[PDB]
């Protein structure tokens, strides 16, 4: 289909800093990708973001009842929903499964540390060779979202293994209380 | 530190709408517009929280009305198609004969309309596939996941085929053992 498309988007955003100590609410309106008007809880009124949003701001700012709804949002909406969902979202912890397998950059000179299934996203992966950290020659996929509330990442060490060498992939992650380490021997 | 977003959209002339909550970029739930039901992204979510799906339908009705208003305001300026970037990956390291999941990741595109087909040895597959709704991005494009559970063999090749009005021809992304 070649007919032109037109998209309206709205995003009501709750931003949380140190739990619910500092909360910021943004009521954001978009035409295609262009945000045209916004309510910011730091401001307490709608403000046009672009020319297209001026009529919106004036209209909604003339409605005192609407504005007072939005000014309480940090309490009645953001902090509220934070409390309802905190246990299965903020407190969700899924620890990583760690696999090490060899590979070849050219038809093994590549050690893959596959870190799978963890939540949340923040993770540190390090490579060791006979107890020494190996920082040169590391490439990674970066952080990958699986879309099912888990992450994965592959961290690859370029190296020429000599016999009698032990390589160690070490994984740190908030679900862990001490680093997770997997060895590979040549 | 943490961000919860209630994200809505409404698309003309397709008359497609969507309503969902997002936590740090993962979907908490969305509202099936046809069945008028809350669909939890993970089953366990629905046993600690509830959501009245009716109110979402009201928000989409306003979104539709506002889209009419903003369309006129823009002098009927339409969206510009942004084509997707597609990646195929596995859930976990691939072992022969041990079940796994192919993931087709469609990212950074708009409008939120896409045809996605899994092909095994060049033939469309249907059995056991699943997918997400359109997940919003911070640059206000979209992303989407498609899933195909499978048994890894040396016989089978797979491709994820993505069609989008921004592409001149379908995008195929390949995977094999």
């Amino acid at each position: 289909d070649t007919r032109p498309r037109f998209l309206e988007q709205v995003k009501h955003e709750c931003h949380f800093f140190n739990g619910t100590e500092r909360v910021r609410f943004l009521d954001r309106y978009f035409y295609h990708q262009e945000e045209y008007v916004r309510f910011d809880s730091d401001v307490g009124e709608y403000r046009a973001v672009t020319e297209l949003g001026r009529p919106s701001a004036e209209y909604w700012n003339s409605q005192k009842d609407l504005l007072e709804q939005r000014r309480a949002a940090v309490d009645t909406y953001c902090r509220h929903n934070y409390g309802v969902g905190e246990s299965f979202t903020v407190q969700r912890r899924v620890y990583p499964e760690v696999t090490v397998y060899p590979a070849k950059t050219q038809p093994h000179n590549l050690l893959v540390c596959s870190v799978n299934g963890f939540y949340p996203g923040s993770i540190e992966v390090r490579w060791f060779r006979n107890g020494q950290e190996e920082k040169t020659g590391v490439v990674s996929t970066g952080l990958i979202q699986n879309g099912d509330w888990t992450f994965q990442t592959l961290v690859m060490l370029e190296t020429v293994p000599r016999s009698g060498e032990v390589y160690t992939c070490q994984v740190e992650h908030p679900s862990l209380t001490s680093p997770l380490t997997v060895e590979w021997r040549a | 530190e943490h961000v919860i977003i209630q994200a809505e959209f409404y698309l003309n002339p397709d008359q497609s709408g969507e309503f969902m909550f997002d936590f740090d970029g993962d979907e908490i739930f969305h509202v099936d517009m046809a069945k008028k039901e809350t669909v939890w992204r993970l089953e366990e979510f629905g046993r600690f929280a509830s959501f009245e799906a009716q109110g979402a339908l009201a928000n989409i009705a306003v979104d539709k009305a506002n889209l009419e208003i903003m369309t006129k305001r823009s002098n009927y300026t339409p969206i510009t198609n942004v084509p997707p970037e597609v990646t195929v990956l596995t859930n976990s390291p691939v072992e022969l004969r041990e079940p796994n999941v192919l993931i087709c990741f469609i990212d950074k595109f708009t409008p939120p309309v896409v045809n996605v087909t899994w092909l095994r040895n060049g033939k469309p597959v249907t059995t056991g596939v699943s997918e997400t709704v359109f997940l919003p991005r911070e640059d206000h494009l979209f992303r989407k996941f498609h899933y195909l559970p499978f048994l890894p063999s040396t016989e089978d090749v797979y491709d994820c085929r993505v069609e989008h009005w921004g592409l001149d021809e379908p995008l195929l992304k390949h995977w094999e053992f």
Binding site: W60, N81 | E52, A56
Partner: peptide, 13 residues
Amino acid sequence: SSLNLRETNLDSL
């Protein structure tokens, strides 16, 4: 137990 929505505003012509 209940997640709250946040109402979308009808704009003006």
